[PDB]
Amino acid sequence: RNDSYTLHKILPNKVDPLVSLMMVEKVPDSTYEMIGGLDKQIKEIKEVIELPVKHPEL
Amino acid sequence: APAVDTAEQVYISSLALLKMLKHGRAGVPMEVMGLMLGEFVDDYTVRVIDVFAMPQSGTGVSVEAVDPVFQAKMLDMLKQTGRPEMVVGWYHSHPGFGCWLSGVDINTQQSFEALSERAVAVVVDPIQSVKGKVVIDAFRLINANMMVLGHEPRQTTSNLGHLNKPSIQALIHGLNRHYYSITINYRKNELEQKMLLNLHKKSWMEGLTLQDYSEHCKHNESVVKEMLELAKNYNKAVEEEDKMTPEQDPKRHLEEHVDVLMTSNIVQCLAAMLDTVVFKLI
Amino acid sequence: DLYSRYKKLQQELEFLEVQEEYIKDEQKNLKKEFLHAQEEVKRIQSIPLVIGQFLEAVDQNTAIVGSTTGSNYYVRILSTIDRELLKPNASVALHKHSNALV
Amino acid sequence: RQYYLSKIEELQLIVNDKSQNLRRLQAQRNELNAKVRL
C-alpha cells in the first residue's frame, strides 16, 4: 500500500519488459508454401521443434 | 472528565483558507507557519475568522519559529485594526508530505495547547492542492494518559465525525494514536461567493462579441472533416453490426462532435443576429 | 366502483406527472454534474506528469508501471485511455503525486 | 354510466402512455447516473 506496506493484492509473475517483448504476439506471415527447396530442412527442423512437443510419447 | 466530541468542527473562513494556501505555496519548498485568529464558539465549534503568516525562520517549523515580539505586535495592531480575535491555533505547510503531525509538530502542538485546551493544528499541502481537491486536515492531539488507560480519545454522539475516512499516510504518522483529525468545514456566506464569482465572470461584452469569422470557418471545416471520417467509421461499424449478435465507439465521438458543432454554430448565428438588431445605427 | 376507479386514475396520472417533472429536473442536474466530473477527469491529465513504462496490465482498470524515477508501481489506469494502445513497454504518463496511468 | 366508462378508458390510455414515457425517462436517468457515479 501507500506507505503502510500492507500486502493487499497478488499480481501476476514478474517478467521484465525487455524480455516480455520477445514474445511473438503478432505471428509473422510466412508459410512453408512460400519456401522453395529446403524440404529436407523443414522436415529436420520439424523433427525437433514439432515432433517432440506434439507427441513426446514416441 | 469532559471529552471532546467527534462532532467538533473547525469552521475555517474563506479568506483564511485563501491566505493559508497562498502562504503555503509562497514558501515552497520550505515549510511555512502562521498563527490562526478566531473564537471558540462552543465545545463543538472552532471558528477560524482569519489567519496571519509569520516570518520564515532558520529553525523551520517549531515553537522557537514563533517569535514572541512579532506575535505580540501583530496581535495588538490587528486588535487596533478591528480583528480582536484570540489566537485559536497554528498552521504549517507540509509540501507534498501529506497532512499529518511530526514529532516537532506534536511538540509545538503541546506548547499551543498549554495556552488553551482547545487548539487545532491544521496543516495544508501547498503542492498537492492542485485545482479541485484541497489537501488540508486539522488535528488537535491525544492526551497520553487518555490513550494509555483505555478510553477512546473522543466521545461519539453522531455520524458527523465519521463522514470522512482517514488516510493511510496520516494514519501511519500517528493519526488516531497521538492526534485525531477534526472535521473541516468552510464558512462561506453569499456575499463572498458572489465576490469570488467575479474571478471568472467574463463580462457583458463577450456575450455579444462575435468570434472571428475566418477562424469560425476554419474550425467548422476541421470539425466537418472529422465528421466525415467518423461517419465512415460509423458506417463500417454498423456494417459489422448486422454480422454481430449481442456479444472507442465511432457513434459516441460523432455525438460529441455534432454537439460541439451545433453549439458553436447556433451560438455564432444567434449572436450575429443579436448584434445585427441591437447594435443598430438608429 | 366506477367513481373510485376514476379517482384512482387521475390520482395515478398526477403522480406520474410529478415523477416526470422530478425526473426532468434530476436529468438536468445530472447533466451538469456529469460535465463537472468530465472536467475533473480532463484536469487530472494536466502537466507535469512523470513518464513511465507500462509493464503489464493486471485488470481492466489497474496496471503495473515502471516509473522513470527507478521504481515500479501498481497503479490505476484512467478509463478514457484507449486500451489497445496500452502495449508492454509503451511509454505512458503517470500522475506526479499518485503515479496513476494518466 | 357511459360517461364514466369513457373517462375510464381515456384516463387509462393517457396513464399507460405516460407510464411508458416515465419508464423511458427513468432508464435514461439511470444510465446517466451510472455514468456520473463511475
UniProtKB/Swiss-Prot annotation, chain B:
Binding site for Zn(2+): 92, 94, 105
Tissues and organs where the protein is expressed, per its UniProt entry: Widely expressed. Highest levels in heart and skeletal muscle.
Keyword Chaperone: no
Domain MPN: 10-145
Modified residues (Phosphothreonine): 245
GO terms of molecular function: endopeptidase activator activity; K63-linked deubiquitinase activity; metal ion binding; metal-dependent deubiquitinase activity; metallopeptidase activity; proteasome binding
Modified residues annotated as Phosphoserine in this record: 129, 203
Keywords from the named record: DNA damage, DNA repair, Hydrolase, Metal-binding, Metalloprotease, Phosphoprotein, Protease, Proteasome, Ubl conjugation pathway, Zinc
Enzyme Commission numbers on file: 3.4.19.-
Residue window of motif JAMM motif: 92-105
Superkingdom assignment: Eukaryota
PROSITE patterns: MPN (PS50249)
GO annotations of cellular component type: cytosol; cytosolic proteasome complex; extracellular region; ficolin-1-rich granule lumen; nucleoplasm; nucleus; proteasome accessory complex; proteasome complex
GO biological process: double-strand break repair via homologous recombination; double-strand break repair via nonhomologous end joining; proteasome-mediated ubiquitin-dependent protein catabolic process; protein deubiquitination; protein K63-linked deubiquitination; regulation of proteasomal protein catabolic process; response to ethanol; ubiquitin-dependent protein catabolic process
Function comment: Component of the 26S proteasome, a multiprotein complex involved in the ATP-dependent degradation of ubiquitinated proteins. This complex plays a key role in the maintenance of protein homeostasis by removing misfolded or damaged proteins, which could impair cellular functions, and by removing proteins whose functions are no longer required. Therefore, the proteasome participates in numerous cellular processes, including cell cycle progression, apoptosis, or DNA damage repair.
Family note: Belongs to the peptidase M67A family. PSMD14 subfamily.
Listed name of the protein: 26S proteasome non-ATPase regulatory subunit 14
Organism the protein comes from: Homo sapiens (Human)
Swiss-Prot record, chain C:
Compartments (UniProt record): Cytoplasm; Nucleus
Part of the intact protein present: 39 to 140 of 418
Family: Belongs to the AAA ATPase family.
Signal peptide stretch: none
Organism of provenance: Homo sapiens (Human)
Protein name: 26S proteasome regulatory subunit 6B
Function: Component of the 26S proteasome, a multiprotein complex involved in the ATP-dependent degradation of ubiquitinated proteins. This complex plays a key role in the maintenance of protein homeostasis by removing misfolded or damaged proteins, which could impair cellular functions, and by removing proteins whose functions are no longer required. Therefore, the proteasome participates in numerous cellular processes, including cell cycle progression, apoptosis, or DNA damage repair.
Name of the encoding gene: PSMC4
Subunit (UniProt): Component of the 19S proteasome regulatory particle complex. The 26S proteasome consists of a 20S core particle (CP) and two 19S regulatory subunits (RP). The regulatory particle is made of a lid composed of 9 subunits, a base containing 6 ATPases including PSMC4 and few additional components. Interacts with NR1I3. Interacts with PAAF1. Interacts with TRIM5. Interacts with ZFAND1.
Curated annotation (Swiss-Prot), chain D:
Compartment(s): Cytoplasm; Nucleus
Source superkingdom: Eukaryota
Coiled coil: none
Protein task: Component of the 26S proteasome, a multiprotein complex involved in the ATP-dependent degradation of ubiquitinated proteins. This complex plays a key role in the maintenance of protein homeostasis by removing misfolded or damaged proteins, which could impair cellular functions, and by removing proteins whose functions are no longer required. Therefore, the proteasome participates in numerous cellular processes, including cell cycle progression, apoptosis, or DNA damage repair.
Family: Belongs to the AAA ATPase family.
Subunit structure: Component of the 19S proteasome regulatory particle complex. The 26S proteasome consists of a 20S core particle (CP) and two 19S regulatory subunits (RP). The regulatory particle is made of a lid composed of 9 subunits, a base containing 6 ATPases including PSMC5 and few additional components. Component of a complex with USP49 and RUVBL1. Interacts with PRPF19. Interacts with TRIM5. Interacts with NDC80. Interacts with PAAF1. Interacts, in vitro, with the thyroid hormone receptor (in a thyroid hormone T3-dependent manner) and with retinoid X receptor (RXR). Interacts with ERCC6.
Protein name from the UniProt record: 26S proteasome regulatory subunit 8
Organism: Homo sapiens
Range covered out of full length: 21 to 58 of 406
